Amino acid sequence: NGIFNTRLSCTFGYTVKATTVRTPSWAVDMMRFNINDFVPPGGGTNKISIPFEYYRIRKVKVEFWPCSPITQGDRGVGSTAVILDDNFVTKATALTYDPYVNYSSRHTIPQPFSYHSRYFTPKPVLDSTIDYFQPNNKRNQLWLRLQTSANVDHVGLGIAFENSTYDQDYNIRVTMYVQFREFNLKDPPL
Amino acid sequence: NGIFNTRLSCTFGYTVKATTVRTPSWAVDMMRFNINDFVPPGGGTNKISIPFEYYRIRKVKVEFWPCSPITQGDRGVGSTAVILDDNFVTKATALTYDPYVNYSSRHTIPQPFSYHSRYFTPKPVLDSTIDYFQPNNKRNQLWLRLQTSANVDHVGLGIAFENSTYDQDYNIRVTMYVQFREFNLKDPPL
Amino acid sequence: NGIFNTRLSCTFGYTVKATTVRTPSWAVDMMRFNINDFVPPGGGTNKISIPFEYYRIRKVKVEFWPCSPITQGDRGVGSTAVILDDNFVTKATALTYDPYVNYSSRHTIPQPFSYHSRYFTPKPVLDSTIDYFQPNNKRNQLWLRLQTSANVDHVGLGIAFENSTYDQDYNIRVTMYVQFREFNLKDPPL
Amino acid sequence: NGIFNTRLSCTFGYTVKATTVRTPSWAVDMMRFNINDFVPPGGGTNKISIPFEYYRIRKVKVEFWPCSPITQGDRGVGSTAVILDDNFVTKATALTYDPYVNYSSRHTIPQPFSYHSRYFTPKPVLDSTIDYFQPNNKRNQLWLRLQTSANVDHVGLGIAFENSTYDQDYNIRVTMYVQFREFNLKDPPL
Amino acid sequence: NGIFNTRLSCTFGYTVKATTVRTPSWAVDMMRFNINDFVPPGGGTNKISIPFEYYRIRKVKVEFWPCSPITQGDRGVGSTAVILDDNFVTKATALTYDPYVNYSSRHTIPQPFSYHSRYFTPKPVLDSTIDYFQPNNKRNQLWLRLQTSANVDHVGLGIAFENSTYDQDYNIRVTMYVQFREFNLKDPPL
Amino acid sequence: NGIFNTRLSCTFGYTVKATTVRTPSWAVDMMRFNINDFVPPGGGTNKISIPFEYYRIRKVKVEFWPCSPITQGDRGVGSTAVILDDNFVTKATALTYDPYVNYSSRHTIPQPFSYHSRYFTPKPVLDSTIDYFQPNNKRNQLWLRLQTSANVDHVGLGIAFENSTYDQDYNIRVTMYVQFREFNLKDPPL
Amino acid sequence: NGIFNTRLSCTFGYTVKATTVRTPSWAVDMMRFNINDFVPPGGGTNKISIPFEYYRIRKVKVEFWPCSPITQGDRGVGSTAVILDDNFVTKATALTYDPYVNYSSRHTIPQPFSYHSRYFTPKPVLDSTIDYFQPNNKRNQLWLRLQTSANVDHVGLGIAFENSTYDQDYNIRVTMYVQFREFNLKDPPL
Amino acid sequence: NGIFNTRLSCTFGYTVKATTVRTPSWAVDMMRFNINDFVPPGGGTNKISIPFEYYRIRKVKVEFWPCSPITQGDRGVGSTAVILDDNFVTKATALTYDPYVNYSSRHTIPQPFSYHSRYFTPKPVLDSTIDYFQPNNKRNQLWLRLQTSANVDHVGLGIAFENSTYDQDYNIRVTMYVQFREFNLKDPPL
Amino acid sequence: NGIFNTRLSCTFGYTVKATTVRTPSWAVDMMRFNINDFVPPGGGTNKISIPFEYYRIRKVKVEFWPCSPITQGDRGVGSTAVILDDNFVTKATALTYDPYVNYSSRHTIPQPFSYHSRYFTPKPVLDSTIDYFQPNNKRNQLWLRLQTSANVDHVGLGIAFENSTYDQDYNIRVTMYVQFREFNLKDPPL
Amino acid sequence: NGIFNTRLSCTFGYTVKATTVRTPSWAVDMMRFNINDFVPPGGGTNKISIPFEYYRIRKVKVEFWPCSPITQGDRGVGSTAVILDDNFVTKATALTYDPYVNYSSRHTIPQPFSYHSRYFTPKPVLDSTIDYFQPNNKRNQLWLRLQTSANVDHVGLGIAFENSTYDQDYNIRVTMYVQFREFNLKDPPL
């Protein structure tokens, strides 16, 4: 009966640069989520402070939180999608158009004080040449050995934002769903 | 009422090298999906062009698209799985056997003109020592602060491909599902 | 009718360091899952051995497996969550407290011989400035071109572990769910 | 008709140390929850200010709350699981790998602004030699005498976090579900 | 077919001190429940008298039992909650106010002859730095090795009590639900 | 939308001493599960490697795993229960009788190669004087601040074992379910 | 995810005076239930031992317990009702008649060895001039700050008893249902 | 079979003072409901005329009754809510604004000839320091000993009223739901 | 058709004293909720600013809110219950044990950043000698006349908290459900 | 129509020895239940006073009953499981760890005043070499001849208890479910 799990989370911060061009214009950065951000290092008998064998993530619920007010206008839309391709559309300071209107995971979220989410499922990556992705299959999804600092990257959440001449502020809530494995609690003598 | 979202996507390209060995043989690369590929940089008042606080990815629907024809044979199978382990089975130019027949997320997809998908859920990573993965829990999954270029990697989609002496071509569609947060639209004066 | 998929998996290994401090204390590493770990390189006509066009991961089922025995005590809890934030809570050798009690994806899994899982959905990342995450939307999630070694990171599984003065051992099972695309099997002449 | 209960809660704070190593790396501390934190001392006719006979906890709903913003990146995943083993995987400042990918309660929660939860059930502990755990049985679960300061420890929530070079901040919400017993309200004379 | 379990229980006793101040006032102690109270030491071929490998607790049903009579008045309320935070609100002989009115697990139980319960789920703790908690996930919750006397603490049941100038008496019933593992019954020769 | 979680787990080991007395006889140790076993210490910007704010454990699924064979006889029963009382029945090397036949959480699990589980819910503890336990209430259960090494104990799993003249061996799997909170991922400059 | 709670209870004692008049005659006292009876005082970092922010009581289950035997006759009825009026019908040593036959919450419970209960919902009071009572609405019911000793009174349970020339004895069980709030566990340094 | 109950009720009267200020303005008093208003004193063999052991209130149905006519205008609204906080918003003769528009239990009831109700559940209070409130849990709610005149206060019903320059009149109906306990009817000899 | 109601609420504050004793220890204060806190005084034609006749409270939903962070550890549990006994278990600065483990309304809520609730029903009190409590009966529950400042106490929410050496902070939300009665709006001439 | 049965029960007593070691530690004894304890000897025409032919036990409902109070703390967990192995994990006075965390029938029951149960099914044993156990099959389960004093042993209930430095007391309730057979009532002449 190897069934046990709980809720794990952190926070972080990134910003899109405030522009000078008035145009309806979009801004890009990637989001890997590799677990070296997310396992603290332990000590003594063990090395990192979630020291188990095999992990897989069940679901992804990524919460949004604005510090931007209801007063703030020049109002536009932000974006968030599911991307799994390993070959990236171009990040720039200013790109001519929006390619996002012709891709698979298009939603609609306004700016600046909007908060929303997406509920989906990630996959791990081992070999760079193939990068093949599974169908929607929970029970036959792979597990792998937990590693120290060479744990595999996991691209987690698409993001895009309307650019204008102003500033905004936001907090970041990421709640993921990890099933844990191999109870082997270490009991030293003496 | 912080509920708002939309569909975000991009595209990219990678290739497995065309071989000289006739054997049933397999090829590997990892797939992180870190959001620096997926948020464009904005300007002026803000920095990246999806400048919100907290993100999590709901689901993953990674679409396949072949440029390979129905005529092309020597026909074999490709592979795609969910991997969440942070400690990788070996990539090579040619490995002796297939370990994939003994892991958790095994599906069956043919080659070369086949297109399919997998529907699953990712998790973010903070600490490298632990890398523990949640159970299948949407509502209690973590959110974190959006960061500029040090956003966390997210290993997204397993891939493996049968190797032979020929070439193939493919396009890549990645539709992810991101819920957005913290409406704080920036209104400058003057 | 571009619907075909199968189960893909690997394994890996990481450790949290065994400590000298007796306190209830936690340990962190990130987990990206970038697909260069997960596609083997092919040869001849093609380059990596899952050489298709477009991928997305359906779900994530990350299995746990302990080598730790039922005898091993000083017993505590490990952790695993869904994180999608791209801005990381601090990894250390020893941090003063646990911030994990105040985040979105909190579950409960004991130590040391415990094994569990999480069932969720990842997203890909293109642009670092935005990193916006989709809502829970499968069918409108993005696909992108498979790339050779610059495939996008995917942050896959949160992890955290109770630290004490002992050792533990664990194996890692990662089963992901990748839908595959673009049958273009390569048939050379001669 | 001895059926009566209500909602009891507190708050606390712990931190994972901010690191210098860039690796995907994990961090660990234990979480007991012994009730001496959770019963205030009374006076006069009675001693602690919840002075009843027999307690058991029905469920556990541990809420997450980030002070980390949506801007904060380098984004990874945190972790949270259910651990019940009494023999601990090693806490360290930096452990080599993540054992959490091979255990029973793996979920996926991102970092840094993510907030999530886990819904599960604890057990009390009397004898150190055995530490046997019940099946999922509510009505035939044990009750014991409330004690003054030697009340038994209860390991409550697994946690693990991705480690990097930055700081984060978090608040902690713990809502537990305790059924109360033995109305014997004390009426002094005079 | 590793499915077998039964009902395990004990009893104990603690008291809140009888006060001199008339005010509506509250009293606190923590409740860990570490399994060294709950496994008796065996002998001969084995060491503690529940000598198995891996444990997790399914649920918590903590029964209340008063020795206080129906006659006893000055009547007030007691409290019991689910706390999972690892950072404690302050115990005192007399604190100025009640913070409990602003937390997650608030119920209502009277005093002095009242008896009630709470039905919830615990988690184990390994690493002090993280202490991340799972979502409500049974099957993917972790197992760990049973240890001798360094078994991990488990914080089990919140408690708080109205303080006045009188005495009360109570018995304590704790019924927990532990699933057992690894039949390896020891048969010596001779 | 602060919902994200994953699966967290560890392992440990404890033993009941092998006896010389032939009698049907029982053995005891407590099981706290405090999260300092279960959060690894991070570094740099943060302290433990699951560095979030608020945690609670959803459920407890504690898996059993024997190293004892099917051949091993002199066959008896082990025990595992839910205890939430904070006042302990007596641990000894040999106690005269079994009080466990008269408590709330009695199940039946054989020895030596048996493996089973219990599915229940823990609570946190703040104040030692009260230690009141909630009713079975998920949504109104408390959250608290994650702390560094003074995180609260959580008594997690009752255990008891039949004693005889032989040895046994067991591994320990603890999968807990922790919901995570407060995405505040830390992005340093420079 | 601020949902956590548990069961809290106490006991007390009051008596109706044994009379000399043979008539069918009734006896009255009020029942406030102010939480200063029900939170024990803590120490050190905090003041009362359930030190949270906001409370509300979900339900009321007030259990009855007689010490009176089945032999005891001259048999009559007792009474218990829900009163919410803040302006009281007259208490006396002997009143001429029973006004209780013409009010809203009339039930029927015999004397002397009878035990029963009532299941209903309380409200808090702030301003004496108004004292307006809500409709049956759970989710839109108010929360307020927990106070030290000036916490607001809560009138909890109506009671009335048939008077005759004999003595009786009773114990008192009060199980209330309190949802708890604001995990802010206090971690001192040093 | 200790199940028996009936309907208990009384009446009382309070007034809000008739003002001179024309403004939309509000008026406050607290409502405890302590059972000394609600148990009559008996004689002879017993002391109060509902002389049982343990009580808890099931529900609260507080009926409204106006003596104000349908003719009476200057028409405004009154208020009634559920308050459980033990720390009070300020009563005055005239306060500047209405804080009630930002709290948990807001309903809408007009003035002056309006009559309505609220259906909810109270809790008892023992210790002033904690004052923690249960979740919505009937069967595990506490019972306590009935006391003579030091029975615990129970804050019962929030009230607020629009103030103007006129008079009104009202009657008060309070029907509560009390379950009774411990049949021990007293039979004297001679 | 005398059916009308709305949501009424306030806030307040109390604290449990921060201790010097390390033990798992509990803290108590009572919670009455008398409506003089909750009706503001009016003027002119009327006296308090909710000037109606008859009130009863439908339900109680007492929300928790922590100012304690997710970082704060030494983590324990708080408590909250339903108490209806009018005879109180002893408040102290430090009581020897926890009687709350043996009463009717036990739930489980952690500390310090936990927030939860309880959903239950209060009763009013008239006569101190009896204090009998109704069964779970809404429609036959009593109403009584609203009074000026002698409105009856209502014991509202049990609370108990784990005590340690640190500080915490909390806000208090109390939403109650009051049905209102007797439209007699006062229209002066001139 | 050979269908007739009724309820049969007894009581007994055993104790775990009170220890000197503070550790979380466990204690073990076996529980056979051979029917020579459970058939009284008759006389005259027959020999034992349930003198029928064939028996089998339908189910097992083993009730717990504590004499330990709600005051008693140092609180831990007890254990109870289903064991069917005939080769025993080691009983000792003190064993190093808990193997119970890695076996099949793990539940969670607290200590000391907890009471719970387990509902399961036994089997008879004839030949020591095999000791094979049936699947869950009622109707095809074996019957055998009732014997005088060489009736076959039946291992009935696993037990394990947390050990500490204190005493506890408990009563034992065992209700089993035996179907009876072969009406052959003996009628002597004369």
TrEMBL record, chains A, B, C, D, E, F, G, H, I, J:
Coiled coil: none
Assigned GO CC terms: host cell; host cell nucleus; T=1 icosahedral viral capsid
Any one GO molecular-function label of the UniProt entry: DNA binding
Segments passing through the bilayer: none
Subcellular localization(s) per the UniProt record: Host nucleus; Virion
Assigned keywords, A-Z: Capsid protein, DNA-binding, Host nucleus, Host-virus interaction, T=1 icosahedral capsid protein, Viral attachment to host cell, Viral penetration into host cytoplasm, Viral penetration into host nucleus, Virion, Virus endocytosis by host, Virus entry into host cell
One record GO biological process: endocytosis involved in viral entry into host cell
Subunit-structure text: Homomultimer. Assembles in the nucleus, presumably in an immature form, then migrates to the cytoplasm once assembled as mature virion. Interacts with Rep; this interaction relocates Rep into the nucleus.
Family designation: Belongs to the circoviridae capsid protein family.
Descriptive protein name: Capsid protein
Organism per entry: Porcine circovirus 2
Span within the parent record: 42 to 231 of 236
